[PDB]
Each structure stands twice: as C-alpha cells, then as structure tokens.
Write a protein that binds this ligand. Structure first.
Ligand SMILES: Cc1cc2nc3c(=O)[nH]c(=O)nc-3n(C[C@H](O)[C@H](O)[C@H](O)COP(=O)(O)OP(=O)(O)OC[C@H]3O[C@@H](n4cnc5c(N)ncnc54)[C@H](O)[C@@H]3O)c2cc1C
Length: 439
C-alpha cells in the first residue's frame, strides 16, 4: 500500500494537463478543476520546440502529434520593408540532430485534445464547471462560485493561467495582469489561394517560421496542417481605442499597419478567411510560487507569464509539469511533499526567469525602429551569421542561449536537484528526508 497524494490541479490548460500527466505517471491521483463548462477546442497555432517535444515523446505522444503537426524547415528573421532575409536558422534536420527532438507547429486545439486524451487514459478526473474563488491553504480546500467546497485533496497546484485566482488568493491581495500596451491581429489564409500568386509560393513549398521585424511591430507567419491554413499574427501598438472588431475593421486596420511592409504581407490581407483582434497582456514575475503551509504551488503563466516573442510559454509549462511529476515520483512519504514543492520552484524559477528575460530581449530586437540602431542590428545579423557570438541579435541563434533553451531536459534537472536535496544541499527545505532515513 504505497503513498498516494491527492493532488488537485486548478485549470485544464496545457500546463495543468502536463502536471496531471507527470504526477499520475508518478503514482498519485490527480483531479483537474477547470472553470469553462467544456474543454477548449479553441485557439490558433502553437510551437512545440525540442525541450517540450522530448518530454511529450517520453509520454508516448509523438505519433498522435505528428499526425496533426508540421515540421518547419527553418526559422527566418526578415526586414519589414523588403522581406529581406537577415537571419536563417536550420531546424530540419538541424534541431533533431543537435537536441534530439522534433520542433512542431500544431494547432492549439489539437495539442490540447491530445493532452486531455492522454490524461483521461491515465485516469485523471476532470471536473468542469468548477470556478474557484477562495482557497484555504492549510486544510486544503477549494471553494467554488456556486458555494460548493472541494476538500478531497492533499495538495493544490495552481494552473489557472494569466487571470489566476490562485495567485491572488495565495498573495492575499488582488493582482490583475499588466497590459503590454500592444495588440495582436490573427489572420488565417488558405494555402491553396497562396499557391495561386507567384510571390507567395515559396512560403508554401518551403514551410518555415517567417518573422518580419519592424518599427514597434512584428509579423509571424507559419503553416498548420488543418485546412492547409496559414497563420499570420501581427503584433503592433494599440495607439487606437475603438476595439471595433468586425471582419472589415481589421482589413482596413491591418492594411494601414502594413503601410510600407513587404508587399507580400499586404497581398495576404486580400486572401483572408478569418480575422481576430485582441489586446495583449501578461504578469510580472513572482518571488514566491509556494505558500508557507507547504500545500500549494503555482505553475505556468500564473507564476512565470512570458512575452510571446520566444515561443516558449507552453514549452516551459510542459517543463513545469514534467518537473512536478519527476519530483512527486520521489514523494513516497507525505512529509516529503512540501520539500518537493520547494525543490521545484527553485529549479523552475531559475529557468523560467531566464526565459522571461530572453523574450523581453527578443522584443527589443524585433521592435527596433528604423535608424542607426536598426542599421547596426541588421549589420550584425548578416555579418556574423557564420561566426556567431554571445549577444547575437537573434536569441534563437545565440550560441549560448540556444543550446541552453533547447537542450534542457526537465527530467534530468529535477533528478539532479533531488540528489542535491538528499545530500542536504537545497536551501529552504524542512529536511523531511532526514527523519525518513534517506541520506
Ligand atoms: C499570442 C500568443 C502566442 C503564443 N505562442 C506560443 C508558441 O508558439 N509556443 C509556446 O510554447 N507558447 C506559446 N504561447 C504561450 C502559451 O499560449 C501559454 O504559455 C499556455 O497557455 C500556458 O498554459 P497554462 O496551463 O500555463 O495556462 P492556460 O493555458 O491559460 O490555462 C488556464 C486555464 O485555467 C482556467 N482558469 C482560469 N481561471 C480559473 C479559475 N479561477 N478557476 C478555474 N480554472 C480557471 C482557464 O479557463 C484555462 O482553461 C503563446 C501565447 C500567446 C498569447
């Protein structure tokens, strides 16, 4: 009769499910308490880089994913004016050869649906319609919007995303998300229609991650297998306030923001099949993800919300869940649980902040206005493309940042950390392992 911790995950996003998967595969019973009445067959494109794919592969999800995801050949940084290529990184075969795991482009609904399916296949209960409002962190209880009280859990894990009620309850005061002051426009265009125009063909027969960097704007363009649709996301300032969000509104607005940009991006505005406009936001990092009671810890965007520039938010939420799981594997005795939550924060924060920084830095590179600093950026990109250095204006190509970002194995790192904890070398723990004969 081994020990089984009753772990309640709040929120069924990517991070919640990754945690439910890893902890169940650890030997414990997970229950996810989401807010939405039904699962989210909703969203657009997401990127699964090696540091997240290798995790999913260890959970036997590679096939189900390959079926619905694309493998971009390379990742390209281009000037906003002419489409001029300034940096090209090889992903196929480069990234599998180096970091030993695929890089994927999958629609968010497909990724969410595969993770929900694997969660259920492992026996996780997913109780929907459970909007959590208050938390008692000592006698672990969750109180819902209807009034009901869930108290069938030993440990709680906040994974409620950006608008996290869990983080508010932990801190003891409100803490809404900070508005980046930017807004995003998502556009879906059938690739059938693009193959009809000569200037666009290269983007369909050579599926890449194309980035246009420009004055306080950037445009990302990639392909997804569904409907062979092309995702075109434009990030620009919200100098305007109407929020008029009809189909024609953006077409006008996006055309205006593309004034002077690669002629190709404006052609694409004519082949639109759907438009979507929204104001970006995120949170500022937290010093503490845990509660003094040692029964609660945050994961995902709730504690380490990242700017979308690096394409790692879900990657590092998967890493969070993977590390949680790897550590709970060692939670063979209940007194071991809080120390585990401690070893996690430490190992996860040092990683999630250094990513959060990079995203911000990538922003500064992408958004440069035309001028001397832009001229130097471009110069450096082109000149040292075959002679990389630390501080290269592409954080993805940076010879130091790059292997660190994509070579990271959440499993091995959490194991290293558990061993450090067994040699008494982890600050901030209660030393539960001592009374249990481990050493
Ligand atoms: C424009 C954009 C592009 C991105 N591109 C990429 C990319 O290419 N690659 C990548 O890896 N990441 C990317 N990201 C990041 C990625 O979308 C997030 O990191 C991801 O959602 C993390 O999942 P999560 O579980 O941490 O949070 P979420 O997915 O937000 O999970 C939150 C869930 O909890 C629920 N919830 C909220 N409040 C409560 C409550 N009080 N009670 C109960 N349930 C609640 C919500 O309804 C939701 O289901 C992008 C993000 C944006 C905005």
């Amino acid at each position: 009769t081994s020990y089984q911790c009753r772990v309640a995950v709040v929120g069924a996003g990517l991070g919640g499910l990754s945690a439910a998967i890893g902890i169940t595969l650890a030997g414990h019973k997970v229950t996810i308490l989401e807010q939405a009445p039904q699962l989210g067959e909703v969203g657009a494109g997401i990127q699964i880089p090696p540091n997240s794919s290798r995790i999913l592969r260890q959970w036997g999800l590679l096939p189900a994913l390959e079926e619905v995801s694309v493998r971009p050949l390379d990742s390209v940084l281009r000037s906003y004016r002419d489409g001029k290529v300034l940096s090209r990184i090889n992903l196929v075969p480069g990234y599998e050869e180096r970091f030993g795991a695929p890089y994927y482009h999958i629609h968010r609904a497909d990724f969410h649906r595969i993770l929900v399916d694997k969660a259920r296949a492992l026996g996780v209960e997913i109780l929907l319609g459970k909007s959590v409002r208050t938390i008692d962190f000592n006698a672990p209880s969750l109180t819902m919007a209807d009034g009901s009280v869930y108290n069938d859990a030993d440990v709680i894990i906040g994974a409620d995303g950006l608008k996290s009620v869990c983080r508010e309850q932990m801190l003891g005061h409100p803490d809404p998300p900070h508005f980046t002051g930017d807004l995003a426009y998502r556009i879906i265009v059938k690739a059938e229609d693009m193959k009809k125009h000569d200037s666009l063909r290269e983007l369909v027969e050579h599926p890449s991650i194309n980035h246009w960097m420009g004055p306080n704007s950037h445009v990302v363009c990639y392909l997804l297998k569904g409907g062979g649709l092309y995702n075109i996301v434009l990030a620009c300032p919200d100098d305007l306030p109407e929020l008029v969000n009809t189909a024609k509104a953006d077409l006008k607005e996006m055309r205006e923001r593309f004034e002077g940009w690669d002629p190709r991006l404006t052609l694409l505005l004519s082949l639109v099949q759907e438009t979507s406009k929204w104001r970006l936001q995120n949170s500022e990092e937290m010093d503490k993800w845990s509660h003094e009671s040692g029964k609660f810890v945050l994961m995902g965007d709730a504690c380490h919300a990242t700017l979308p520039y690096l394409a790692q938010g879900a990657a590092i939420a998967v890493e969070d869940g993977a590390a949680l799981g790897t550590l709970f594997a060692h939670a063979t005795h209940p007194s071991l649980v809080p120390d585990v939550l401690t070893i996690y924060e430490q190992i996860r924060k040092s990683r999630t902040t250094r990513v959060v920084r990079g995203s911000t830095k990538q922003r500064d590179i992408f958004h440069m206005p035309d001028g001397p600093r832009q001229r130097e950026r471009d110069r450096q990109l082109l000149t040292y493309a075959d002679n990389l250095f630390e501080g290269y204006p592409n954080q993805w190509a940076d010879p130091v940042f790059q292997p660190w970002l994509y070579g990271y194995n959440a499993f091995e790192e959490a194991e290293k950390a558990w061993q450090k904890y067994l040699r008494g070398h982890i600050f901030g723990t209660t030393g539960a392992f001592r009374e249990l004969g481990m050493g």
